C-alpha cells in the first residue's frame, strides 16, 4: 500500500522545548530514501500547522495545558490521516509529542470494525485531568481515545471512543502513575511491562501480541514512542526511563509485526533532537520504520 | 515485616579504600525512602563501629589481612542482626566489602533449621588462608560460613557452621580461584555462572534457584555483590570483572524473589563511590532494593 | 538599543541537513530570555522563508550550488535586515548557514559609510566559483560581499560591494583553501589565525581588533561562525576544524567587544542541532549572545 | 611548619547529600602521603562530629537553613583550629561545605594583626539571609566573616569581624548573586572574576594578588572551593558553573603561593565523591595540595 | 593437539589502513599466555609475508583490487597452513582483513572429505567481481572458498571448490549486499542473521548449528570475524555494523563450540588497533579465543 | 632539504607492548602525504630491524633491561642516520621508545661542531642504572647522549659525549625522578617545566630556547616524545602524565621552529596504537611534523 507521511511538529503537549523538531529529524535521518528502496510509493504530505499556546490563564485548565491549542491541531491531524486513509494510502505519522496519538486515532479508527493499538512505549500514556501528576496532555492520549478525558481531546473527530480496552497493548511499560495503574487494571488493558519482557522474552511477547489482536481486530495502529526504548540506543526523547527496550529488540518487534503483516497505520513519536546525541534517535526511528515496512536482513 | 538497616562501612576485608563508604552512598541514593514509599515500616540502626588495623608485621599471619579487626567487626555486626531478628524485623545490612557476610550470616542463620543462600556475585568467595590468592578476607565469607577457614572466622556469633553447601545457590558467578573451583566442586555447591545465565536466560535460572531452595530451606539470605552485574551496569566496585548480569536481568531476578516470598534476609554489598561514577552502583543497589521488597512496574 | 531577531533557517549554502534547525536550536537555548534579562527590548521577528533547491541539472552552474535559491533568500533577508535597522533597532540575525552574512550585510551595510566586519571563524568564506572546492556558497558570503563572486550573489539589495578589504579582521582561522590564502594575501584583509591567537593572546588579538576597526569604520557586524571555536566546545557545525578557539577565549572577546561599544550588528551562524550534542552548541551561541549584550561577571 | 590535617564531614550548609563524605575522599586520594613525602611533620586531628540538622520549622529560619547545627559545628571547628595554631602547627582543614569557612576562620583569624584571605572560588559566598536565593548557609560564611550575617555565625568564636574586606581577594568567580555584586562593589572587596583571569591571565593575577596582600596583612588564609576549577577538571561538586579555572592554573597558582610563603592557615572544600567521577576531584585537591605545600616539578 | 600460531599482516583485500596490525595487536593482547594457561602446546609460527600493492595503472583491480599481491600472499598462507595440519597441529591463523580466509581454507580443506565452515560475521563476504560494490577481495573469500569467483582466488592451492554450500552457517549477518542476499539464497547457505539470534537466542542457534554440521562434516573450521560483534563491543573494525552480537553472546558461542568438541581449524579476523579504543578488540578476540579452546568458568 | 623517514619498531627500551607499532601509525595517519603536500622531496628507508630479548637469566638487565638488543637496534640506527645526513637530506626518525634517541644522536651529532637538542616531553630521561627507579633504558636516552651511562649505551656510534649538557633545553617536563633533578641541576641543563609554561606562556618559553640555541649551536635536533603533550591530547603513550602542554600549544612550538629555521634533525617518539583512542595520537604527531616541516594557517 502507498505511503503518505504527514510531520506533526508537536510540543503543545509538553513542557520541554525541541520535540517539534522530531518530524524533520527523521526526514534529515532518511525515512522517505529508506522506504522508496523498499519501492514503496511514498509520499510526503508536509506538516500540520501548530498554533502557540494559550495563556495557561484562560486555557481549558491547568491539569490540561494548552488544551486548545493542542485540540485544535489534533482536529487538523484527523482530517489529514483520514483524508490519507480515504485515498487508500497507508498514514505514517511523524511526532512531535505523543498527544498528537489523539488526531491520528481519530483520522484512523472511525475507518475499523475494530481498531487495534499496539503502543510500544515506556509510560501507560492514559492519565486524565484528575490522575495527571504534571497536566501535560502528551501523557492522555490513550486514555482520550479510548474515551476517557475532556471532551475536547475525547470528541476530536466527532466521535467516540476510538478504540476499546480490549483491542489495546501496551508493550515495554515502565513508569506508571498510580492514576494509570489503576485505569489499566480496572479497563482491562493487556500490557507487557519490562518484566514481561524480560521473563518471556520479546519473541513471546511479540508472538502474544500478533495473536491477540490479529483474533479479534480488523486493522492495528502502531503508536510508537522512542522513549520505549533505554535512553542509552534513544537518548533524544523528553522523559526518558531507564532499563528499557534494547535496539535489537525493536529491530525484532518490528520485523515480526512486519511479517504478521497487521499494521494498517503507524505514528513515531517524543523524537526531540535537542535533547539527542547527533541524531542518534532519530536515527533509530528511521531503521526502526524500515524494519516494519518490510526491510529485511536476508 | 518491617525493616532494619545496619550500616557496616567495612574496608578491612580489602586493599582499596573507598568501599567503606558503600553504606552511605546507598543512603545518600535514597533508600529509606525507596523503601517508605512501598510502606515499610523501616528504621535505619546506623553503623557498625570498625576499628583501625594492627601493624601488618604484627598481625600473625598474611594469608589473612586484618583478622582481628575483621573478626571484631564481625561479631559486632553478628550481635545487631540478631537482635533485629529477635525483635522479628528483617535485616538489610549494607556494605562495605563482602567480609561482612560472614557476621551477617552469624547473625541470621541461628534463627532457622535450615538457611538458605543466594550469593549473587562475580566471584565465588569461597578461598581459605590456604587457597586466597590475596590474603584477603573479602574473598572468605562463604567458605567461612560454611565452616572453612580460620576459626577466627567460622567462629563468629559463637557456633559453626551457619549454612549447608547443598542449601546454596551461586548465581553470576565468571571469576573463580582454582582452589575456588575445586570446593565447589567437592562440596557440591549449586553454582550458575555466567554460562548457564547465557545458556538458559535468567528467568530459568531464576525458577530452578527458587524451588530448589524453596523445596529444602526454611529461611532464604540474599547476598548481593553488585560486581555480579557488569562493570558498565555497576562501575563502582573494587573487584570488577566484565561479561556481567544487565540491570535488566538484576532486576527480574529481584522480583522474581520478591514474588516467590523466600528472601528471609539481606544484604548489598561492595559498593564503592570512589571508583563510580556518580553514584551509579549505589543507585543501582537501591533500585534492586526496591525491587526486591515488591516495587513493580503495574 | 532595542534588539529584533531574525531567524534564517538556511542550509542551502551547503549540503548537510540540520543547519536549518539552528534558529530554533538557539531559540530554545534561551536567547529571547536570556536577553531580556539584561534589560533589552527584544523582539523576535520570525524566520525568513527559504525556498526549496530547483533540479541540479536543471541549475546552470556546479560551482554555485542552489544559487537561485540563496540568493532569493538572502534579498529577503536583505529587505528585513534594512527594515529593522530603519527602526532604530539593531538586528540579531540567527543561522543557518553561513551563506547568509550575505543577506546580513547587504541590510545593514547601506546605512554606515564604512562598515567594518568581524568575521569569528576558522575559515575565510572568501572563495568564488573559480576557487571554490565544494560549489557550496556557505563558503562563498565574505568574498561577495567584498564585492567578488557571482552578481547574483555580489548584487543582493542593489549594491556593492557591502565593505572594504581593509575594514576587515578575520579571528580564528585554521582553514583556508589556497584559493582563499591568496585572496586574503591580495585583498589586504587582516587575520588572526590560530598562529596568532597562541602567539599573542586573545586579550592582544582583541585589543588590536578593536582599535584597528575603532580607527577607520562608523559600525561594525560581528559575523560569528560556532564553528570558530574547537569542536570539543562547539561540536554542532557541518564544518568543524579541530584545535580551535575556547569557551573562554570566546566569552573574553564577547566582552571585551560589548565594552569597546562597537559592534552594531551581529549574526550566529552554522549551529546544527543534529550534529550535536544535547543542544550544546546553541547554548554556547547563547552565552556568548549574553555576554556580547553587556552581561557581565561581576 | 608541622600541618594538623581537621575533616570536618560538613553537610549541613547546604542540600545535596554526598559532601560529608569530601574530608575522608581526599584521606583515600592520600593527602597524608603526599604531604610526609614533601618531608612535612604531618598530624591527622580526625573529624569535626556534625550534629543532624533540626526541622526546618524550629531553626534559626527560613533564610538560614540548619542555623545552630551549622553554628554548633563551627564552633566547636573553631575550638579545633585555634588550638592547632597555639600549638605553633599549621591548620589544614577538608571539607564539606563551604560554610565551614566559618569555623575556620573564627580558629584563625583571632591570631593575626591583620588576617588576608585569598577565596579561590566560582562564588562570592558573601549573601545574608536577606540575599540569599537559597537559605543554603554556604553561600554566607565570607559575608559571615566579614561581619555580616545572623549573630549566630557571626560572633563564632566570641569576636567579630574575623577579616577586614580590603584584605579579601576573589580569585576565579563566574556566578554571583545580585545582592552578592552589591556586596562585593559596596565593601570593596578585590576580585578577579574569569574575565581578569582571561585577560591578565593567572600569572598575573597572582602576581597582584600576592603584593597585594603581602603588602598589608601579617597572615593570609587560602580558602579553596574545588568548584573554582572547571566542573571537567572537578566534577564532583555541589554547584558547578562552567568555564572555569583550569588543572594547570590551579596548580601555578598553588606554586606561586607556595613559593610566595604567605599562606598560613588553609582549607579546601566542597569536594563531593558521590558527583565525582572515581574521585577525581579529590585527587585534584590533593595535588593542589601538594603544589602549595612545596612540591615542585624540578 | 598442539597449536601453531600464524600471523597474517593483510590489509590488501580492503582499503583501510591498520587492519595488518591485527596479528601483533592479539599478541599483544596476551594469546600466548592465554592458551599456554590452558595448558596448550601453543607455537607461534610468525607472519606471512605480505607484499605492496602495484600500480593500478599497472595491473587492474578495480573490480578485484591487489588481486595479485592477496593472491599471492593466501598462496604462501596455504602453504603454512597445511604444513601445521600435516604436522598434526590445529592451525590458528591471525588476521588481517578477511580475504586471508583464502589461504586459510586453501591449506585446511584439503585435508578434509567434508570441511564444514562456521562463518561468524556481520557479513556475507560472498561477493564476486560481478556482485561486489567495492571492488575490495576481503568481501569475497566464502564465495571463492565455495568456487565462485576469479581462478586468481578460487583456484589457490591447486583445487577448488575448498567447501560445499551445504556445509555453511553463517552466523551474526546484518549486512548483505544485494548479489550476496542472491548467492546464499540461490546457493541454500544456511543462515542466521540478527533477527534469527534475537527471535531464538544464542544457545538455539549454536544447537542447531552444531548438529547440523556435526551431521554431516568431518572437521570445522571457525572463520570469525570481529566486526560480528557489535561496535560498542568491538569498535576496532574496519566495516562496522550496529546491532551486533553482544560480548556473552560471542562467549556462550565459543564455550558451546569448545564443549561440542566439532572446531579443527581456526581464524581471527579483522582487528584494526588503529580504528580501536584501547587494544579492546584485539582483547575480546583473545578473550573468545580461550574460550574456544576449553576455558571454563568453573 | 629533502627528507628520510626511517621507523624504528623499538620497545626495548620499556616493558608495555604496543609502542613498536608507532612507525606504522604514523605512517598510516598519512606523513608521507602530509609533507608531499608541503613540495617536499620525501623519502621512506623504511624501518631498522629488532631484535628479541635475550632471557633475563641469560644476560643481565634489571638496572639495564634488554642492553644488548637495545644498544644493536641503535648501532643500527645510528649507521642509517649518518648515511642520510651524508646524502644531504633530513633525517626524520619515527619512534618507537624513546631509547631509539641514542641512534638518533649518534648518527647526526659526529656531523656538528655543537649540536643542540630540544627535549620535548613530560620526562628528563636522564636517568642510569644508578638512578633509574624502572631499568627502563627509554628512560636513559638523553643521560646516554650526554656521556653517562653504560658504555654499550654511550658509545653507540664509536664515539662520545654526542652533545653538552649546555645545548640541551627541556621542555613541557612533568615527571621527573629525584636523581633526574640532581643530574639536570648539576649538569645545568635548561628546562622548562610546566610551571614555566603556565607562568611565561608557550610563546616566551619558544623564544627564549630558540634565541639560547641559535646563539650557541650549529645545529638542532628535535626530540619529541608525544608524551610531552596532555594524555587527553595524546592518550596513546606509555608513561602519560597529566597536566600537560596542550594541542594548540604544540602547534606553536612547531610553527615557531619552522619560522626559526633552526631544526637539522627530529624524531616523533612513544607512540603507542594500542594504548589509544582511534589513532589519535599518531594524528597529532603527522600534525605537528606538517607545523615543523612549514605548514602554515595563512
Ligand atoms: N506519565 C507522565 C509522563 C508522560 C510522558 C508522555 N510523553 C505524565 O503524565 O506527566
Ligand atoms: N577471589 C579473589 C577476589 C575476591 C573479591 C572479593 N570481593 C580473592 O579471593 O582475592
Ligand atoms: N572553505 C570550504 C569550507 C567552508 C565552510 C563554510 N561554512 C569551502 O569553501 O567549501
Ligand atoms: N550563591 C548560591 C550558591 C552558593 C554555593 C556555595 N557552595 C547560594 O548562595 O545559594
Ligand atoms: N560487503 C561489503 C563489505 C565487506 C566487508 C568485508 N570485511 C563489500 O563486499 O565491500
Ligand atoms: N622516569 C621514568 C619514566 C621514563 C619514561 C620514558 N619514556 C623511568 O626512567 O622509568
Ligand atoms: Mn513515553
Ligand atoms: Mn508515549
Ligand atoms: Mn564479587
Ligand atoms: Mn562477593
Ligand atoms: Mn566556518
Ligand atoms: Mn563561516
Ligand atoms: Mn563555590
Ligand atoms: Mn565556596
Ligand atoms: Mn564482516
Ligand atoms: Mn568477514
Ligand atoms: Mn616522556
Ligand atoms: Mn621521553
Redesign the pocket.
Known amino acids: 500500500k502507498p505511503i503518505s507521511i504527514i510531520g506533526v511538529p508537536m510540543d503543545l ?2 513542557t520541554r522545548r525541541g520535540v517539534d523538531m522530531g518530524p524533520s529529524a527523521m526526514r534529515y535521518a532518511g525515512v522517505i530514501e529508506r522506504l522508496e528502496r523498499l519501492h514503496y510509493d511514498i509520499e510526503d504530505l508536509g506538516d500540520i500547522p501548530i498554533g502557540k499556546a494559550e495563556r495557561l490563564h484562560e486555557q481549558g485548565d491547568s491539569r490540561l495545558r494548552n488544551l486548545k491549542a493542542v485540540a485544535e491541531a489534533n482536529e487538523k491531524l484527523a482530517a489529514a490521516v483520514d483524508q490519507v486513509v480515504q485515498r487508500g494510502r497507508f498514514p505514517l505519522v511523524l511526532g512531535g ?2 498527544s498528537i496519538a489523539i488526531g491520528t486515532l481519530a483520522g484512523v479508527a472511525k475507518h475499523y470494525e475494530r481498531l487495534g493499538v499496539i503502543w510500544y512505549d515506556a ?3 492514559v ?1 486524565t485531568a484528575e490522575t ?3 497536566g ?1 496532555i ?3 492520549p490513550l486514555a482520550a481515545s479510548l474515551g476517557f478525558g475532556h471532551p475536547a481531546l475525547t470528541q476530536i473527530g466527532g466521535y467516540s471512543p476510538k478504540i476499546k480496552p480490549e483491542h489495546v497493548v501496551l508493550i515495554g511499560v515502565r ?3 498510580e492514576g ?1 495503574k489503576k485505569f489499566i487494571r480496572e479497563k482491562g488493558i493487556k500490557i507487557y511491562t519490562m518484566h514481561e519482557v524480560d521473563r518471556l522474552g520479546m519473541t513471546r511477547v511479540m508472538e502474544e501480541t500478533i495473536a491477540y489482536l490479529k483474533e479479534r481486530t480488523d486493522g492495528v495502529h502502531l503508536s510508537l ?1 522512542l ?1 520505549g526504548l533505554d535512553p542509552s540506543d534513544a537518548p533524544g526523547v ?2 526518558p526511563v531507564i532499563g528499557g527496550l534494547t535496539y535489537r529488540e525493536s529491530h525484532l518487534a518490528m520485523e515480526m509485526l512486519a511479517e504478521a503483516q497487521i499494521i494498517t497505520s503507524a505514528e513515531f513519536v ?1 523524537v526531540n533532537p535537542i535533547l539527542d546525541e547527533r541524531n542518534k534517535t532519530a536515527s533509530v526511528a528511521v531503521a526502526l520504520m524500515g524494519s516494519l515496512f518490510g526491510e529485511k536482513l536476508m
Chains 1, 2, 3, 4, 5, 6 share one sequence.
Open positions: 503537549g509538553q509529542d505523543h509510560h501507560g500514556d492519565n495527571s501528576p504534571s501535560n502528551h501523557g492522555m513508569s506508571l502513575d494509570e514512542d522513549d523528553g522523559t517524543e
